[PDB]
């Protein structure tokens, strides 16, 4: 179901992201709740500071630590997860 | 036509933000081109590192430097501009 659009992040950290986002959707309906759930696992598992954008239509321009960015689709939802700060 | 939902930044930096989004929309259509224009201006004006999301349907959970975050609607889009790293 996952579709990785773009990434700069180890293939296993990526799987981790997608597992996390799958969990998040089993548990949360509305974008802000999903995002906050994904973000917090990653600060916890891979250290702060991470940022997550969840929605059905957005664009972005961000700066991320090298090797810590993932942008993907998990159905009609697009997830952006990256680390900066 | 700007409507400021949430913010943590000087009223004067909010105006600036909006003026910058306004300029961004006069010359860009594509959500990621809008975002990048704004992001790069704030890096220039207020130093790195900023992140900007431009979208009609998204949510997010991010961390930002105190006094440097704004989320607002302009036109038919929602803008998130914040600094982190």
């Amino acid at each position: 179901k996952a579709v990785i659009k773009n990434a700069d992040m180890s293939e296993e950290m990526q799987q981790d992201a997608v597992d996390c986002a799958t969990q998040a959707l089993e548990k949360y309906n509305i974008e802000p709740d999903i995002a906050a759930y994904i973000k917090k696992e990653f600060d916890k598992k891979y250290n702060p500071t991470w940022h997550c954008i969840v929605g059905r239509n957005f664009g972005s321009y961000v700066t991320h630590e090298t090797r810590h960015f993932i942008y993907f689709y998990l159905g009609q939802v697009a997830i952006l997860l990256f680390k900066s700060g | 036509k700007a409507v400021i939902k949430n913010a943590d930044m000087s009223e004067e930096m909010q105006q600036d933000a909006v003026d910058c989004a306004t300029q961004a929309l006069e010359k860009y259509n594509i959500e990621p081109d809008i975002a990048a224009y704004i992001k790069k201006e704030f890096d220039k004006k207020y130093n790195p590192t900023w992140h900007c999301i431009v979208g009609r349907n998204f949510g997010s959970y991010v961390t930002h430097e105190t006094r440097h975050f704004i989320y607002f609607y302009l036109g038919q889009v929602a803008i998130l501009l914040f600094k982190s790293g």
Binding site: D8, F58, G59, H64, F69, L80 | A35
Partner: peptide
């Protein structure tokens, strides 16, 4: 250790 990237819907 940093990169700038755009995402598209």
């Amino acid at each position: 250790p940093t990169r700038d990237v755009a995402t598209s819907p």
